[PDB]
Paper text:
The DNA damage response protein 53BP1 (p53-binding protein 1) influences the cell cycle dependency of DNA double-strand break (DSB) repair pathway selection. The localization of 53BP1 to chromatin also requires that it binds histone H4 di-methylated at K20 (H4K20me2) via a tandem Tudor domain (53BP1TT), while BRCA1-BARD1 recruitment requires unmethylated H4K20 recognized by an Ankyrin repeat domain in BARD1. We show that a series of water-soluble small molecules targeting the methyl-lysine binding cavity in 53BP1TT function by stabilizing a previously unknown lowly populated autoinhibited homodimeric state of 53BP1TT in which the histone binding surface of H4K20me2 is buried within the protomeric interface. Our work therefore identifies an auto-associated form of 53BP1—autoinhibited for chromatin binding—that can be stabilized by small molecule ligands encapsulated between two 53BP1 protomers.
Using NMR spectroscopy, we independently verified that 53BP1TT-CC mimicked the homodimeric state of 53BP1TT bound to UNC3474. Noticeably, the addition of UNC3474 led to the splitting of several NMR signals in the 1H-15N HSQC spectra of 53BP1TT-CC. The addition of the reducing agent dithiothreitol (DTT) changed 53BP1TT-CC to a monomeric state as expected, which, like 53BP1TT-PN, had no affinity for UNC3474. As we showed in vitro, 53BP1TT-PN and reduced-state 53BP1TT-CC cannot dimerize and are thus insensitive to UNC3474 and to the related, lower affinity compounds UNC2170 and UNC2991.
Numbering used by the authors:
A (entry chain A), B (entry chain B): 1484 to 1602
Write the structure that this text describes.
Amino acid sequence: NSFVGLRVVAKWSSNGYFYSGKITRDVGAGKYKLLFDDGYECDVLGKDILLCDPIPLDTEVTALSCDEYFSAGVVKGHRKESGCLYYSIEKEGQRKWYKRMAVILSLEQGNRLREQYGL
Amino acid sequence: NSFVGLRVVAKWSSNGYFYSGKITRDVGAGKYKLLFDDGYECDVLGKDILLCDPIPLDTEVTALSCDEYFSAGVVKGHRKESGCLYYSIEKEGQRKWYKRMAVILSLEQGNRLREQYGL
């Protein structure tokens, strides 16, 4: 049951989005240190951490982009190119590719995925 | 007079990068509430906030990319298309376009700009 170095989607704020990152260390009491893709390293409780290296397909997510700001869409495909992972988020009936860090889950979506994928 | 609604590059961690965002509110004691482009809204001290809506040209920055991870480069141009702003970061003698959220300043790089652009 090694959970070190596994990419996970976890929230680091009491009321915030579930941002993507990777587990850098497994501390006691189920509190894992996560280095997030944006460079912020901090400790997060297992409940707040979702063990989803590939974002599940056909899962509602929040896509962050300069255009449309914080849109809501559904994953409709994955594409790993030269290590870079992209998710095909369908917003308003239109599929667009978003980087791993450009896709984060809302509180409701994170809670929905916690039941199945939750540390 | 007011700094609210002005894009700024500020750090929200004691030892962290200067992430881009926008001032959502001006609170007392020079402590401004910033909504960052990643959706994290929190209060930041004026020292940690850099007033640079367009990232300064010919300024050393840290480009975050899936490939090359946290590379370092220098801005060599800007391009705003349909609101989306891209910076031409020159890494290893090669100019590559990065989104606004894809470019963040390091501790030393951000400090170097504090003397000029610092709240």
